Design an enzyme around this catalytic site. Structure first.
Site, PDB file in Angstrom:
ATOM      1  CD  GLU A  35       0.193  54.594   8.748  1.00 27.65           C
ATOM      2  OE1 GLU A  35       0.338  54.686   9.967  1.00 27.65           O
ATOM      3  OE2 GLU A  35       0.542  55.451   7.939  1.00 27.65           O
ATOM      4  CG  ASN A  46      -0.055  60.767  17.453  1.00 27.63           C
ATOM      5  OD1 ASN A  46      -1.123  60.627  16.831  1.00 27.63           O
ATOM      6  ND2 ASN A  46       0.971  59.960  17.333  1.00 27.63           N
ATOM      7  CG  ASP A  48      -0.805  65.359  17.586  1.00 30.32           C
ATOM      8  OD1 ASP A  48      -1.399  64.481  18.201  1.00 30.32           O
ATOM      9  OD2 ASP A  48      -0.802  65.468  16.350  1.00 30.32           O
ATOM     10  CB  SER A  50      -4.273  63.401  17.239  1.00 28.53           C
ATOM     11  OG  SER A  50      -2.982  63.071  16.806  1.00 28.53           O
ATOM     12  CG  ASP A  52      -1.862  58.194  14.411  1.00 29.51           C
ATOM     13  OD1 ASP A  52      -2.452  59.181  14.104  1.00 29.51           O
ATOM     14  OD2 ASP A  52      -0.639  58.156  14.697  1.00 29.51           O
ATOM     15  CG  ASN A  59      -4.349  62.070  13.608  1.00 31.40           C
ATOM     16  OD1 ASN A  59      -4.888  63.146  13.693  1.00 31.40           O
ATOM     17  ND2 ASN A  59      -3.507  61.613  14.496  1.00 31.40           N
ATOM     18  CG  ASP A 101     -12.714  64.915   2.864  1.00 34.06           C
ATOM     19  OD1 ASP A 101     -13.576  65.176   2.004  1.00 34.06           O
ATOM     20  OD2 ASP A 101     -12.890  64.942   4.064  1.00 34.06           O
TER      21      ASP A 101
END
Length: 129
Positions: A35, A46, A48, A50, A52, A59, A101
């Site tokens: 990672e 990103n 998008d 978001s 990380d 994220n 989760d």
């Protein structure tokens, strides 16, 4: 901080990641390796909206709040910047939450791609856990 694998392993182990939800320590170390290259400061911004964050590249859409990511759920109930700490606790706690989760470690694409199916114990091999 850029961890060494063994240091990270030990830290992660102190935080209870070995065998957390059945994922051995090496998995977590491997995840971190791929990672973030063990870099607690790693960020990947990103497209998008978001980002990380941190050693586990958690994220910001679901997991931590960076205040700029649409759809923020902040399920780890932390600012994402907490995931950029040199100490890994927040990342670990959030990683645990990610798994709690209902994710496996498939939540981490680098785990899935680069750790899954591998000798993840290589990442803790030869270390002082």
């Amino acid at each position: 901080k850029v961890f060494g694998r063994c240091e990270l392993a030990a830290a992660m182990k102190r935080h209870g990641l070995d065998n957390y939800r059945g994922y051995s320590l090496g998995n977590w170390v491997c995840a971190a390796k791929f990672e973030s290259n063990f870099n607690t400061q790693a960020t990947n911004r990103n497209t998008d909206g978001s980002t990380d964050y941190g050693i586990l590249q958690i994220n910001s859409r679901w997991w931590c709040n960076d205040g700029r990511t649409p759809g923020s759920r902040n399920l780890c109930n932390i600012p994402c910047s907490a995931l950029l700490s040199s100490d890994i606790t927040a990342s670990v706690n959030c990683a645990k939450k990610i798994v709690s989760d209902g994710n496996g470690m498939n939540a981490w694409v680098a785990w899935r791609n680069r750790c899954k199916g591998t000798d993840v114990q290589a990442w803790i091999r030869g270390c002082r856990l």
